[PDB]
């Protein structure tokens, strides 16, 4: 009868393969609604 969650218990002296690699996952999504996340030039005359 096991408790699911187990702790990383990070330490600063471990390897580069056991050290906290923060992660961010960006998903871009497209519905039948007005898209608004549009993410981005000089003037001359005569």
């Amino acid at each position: 009868c096991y408790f699911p969650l187990r702790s990383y218990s990070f330490r600063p002296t471990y390897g580069v393969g056991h050290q906290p690699y923060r992660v961010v996952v960006l998903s871009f999504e497209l519905l039948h609604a007005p898209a608004t996340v549009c993410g981005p030039t000089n003037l001359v005359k005569n």
Partner: antibody, heavy 117, light 110 residues
Framework: EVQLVESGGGLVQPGGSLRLSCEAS????????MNWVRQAPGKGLEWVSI???????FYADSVKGRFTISRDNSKNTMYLQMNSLRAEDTAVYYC???????????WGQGTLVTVSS | QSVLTQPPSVSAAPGQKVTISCSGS????????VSWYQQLPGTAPKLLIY???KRPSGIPDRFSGSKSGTSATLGITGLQTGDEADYYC???????????FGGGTKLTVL
């Protein structure tokens, strides 16, 4: 009492096919991470295959592709489909429960396997 | 190429502490957890030490396990006759994505 008992071991010709089986009591094979490990006479336990709760399988390098691990729907028993044998598959296969990926808590008694004519 | 290396044999007389060293590349034993198994003759491996130091389910005491850098050490105060078996060290090599075991020591009591 907890126990895992395995059958299906005997003489077989090179290139044959077997269905070894792991029967689980007191425990439920469709949940605990189950493992097939081997040891040729005079040799060292070598990881053959691990079955995850969610159905995912992992196999070693030497034992890739030819083999297959499977988890019964209702019989509370797991099976190894050994196919395309060679000389280096002479073994005493064991099935063992492994908390996560950390340590192998329970080991079955042992089922000889021989590849010769 | 990662497969932990273990001395072919270790021997001591009763009353003398026995030390076994399992060494491997820091790909698997420097980033994951060692565990130590005992195989009595003609039987099946019995878990002995898990999670780098612990001793499960009331194993006979004086059995100790430690981890130093890229190595692991098992220790038995004295060399009792009943402890004669093969000893293996296992870690989950993520590079190979596979359990990797040591060579195995033939502990003989002098």
């Amino acid at each position: 009492e907890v126990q895992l008992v395995e059958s299906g071991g005997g003489l077989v010709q090179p290139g044959g096919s077997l269905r070894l089986s792991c029967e689980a009591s007191e425990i439920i094979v469709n949940r605990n991470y189950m493992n097939w490990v081997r040891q040729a006479p005079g040799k060292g336990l070598e990881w053959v295959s691990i079955i995850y709760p969610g159905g995912s399988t992992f196999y070693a390098d030497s034992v890739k592709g030819r083999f297959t691990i499977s988890r019964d729907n209702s019989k509370n028993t797991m099976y190894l489909q050994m196919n395309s044998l060679r000389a280096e598959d002479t073994a005493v296969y064991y099935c063992a429960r492994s908390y996560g990926d950390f340590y192998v808590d329970f080991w079955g008694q042992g089922t000889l396997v021989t590849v010769s004519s | 190429q990662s497969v932990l290396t273990q001395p072919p044999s270790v021997s001591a007389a009763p009353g003398q502490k026995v030390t076994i060293s399992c060494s491997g590349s820091s790909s698997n034993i420097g980033n994951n957890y060692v565990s130590w198994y005992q195989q009595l003759p003609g039987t099946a491996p019995k878990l002995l030490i898990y999670d780098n130091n612990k001793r499960p389910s009331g194993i006979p005491d004086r059995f100790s396990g430690s981890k130093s850098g890229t190595s692991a050490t098992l220790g038995i105060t004295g060399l009792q006759t009943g402890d004669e078996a093969d000893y293996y060290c296992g870690t989950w090599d993520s590079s190979l994505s596979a359990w990797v075991f040591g060579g195995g020591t033939k502990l003989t009591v002098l």
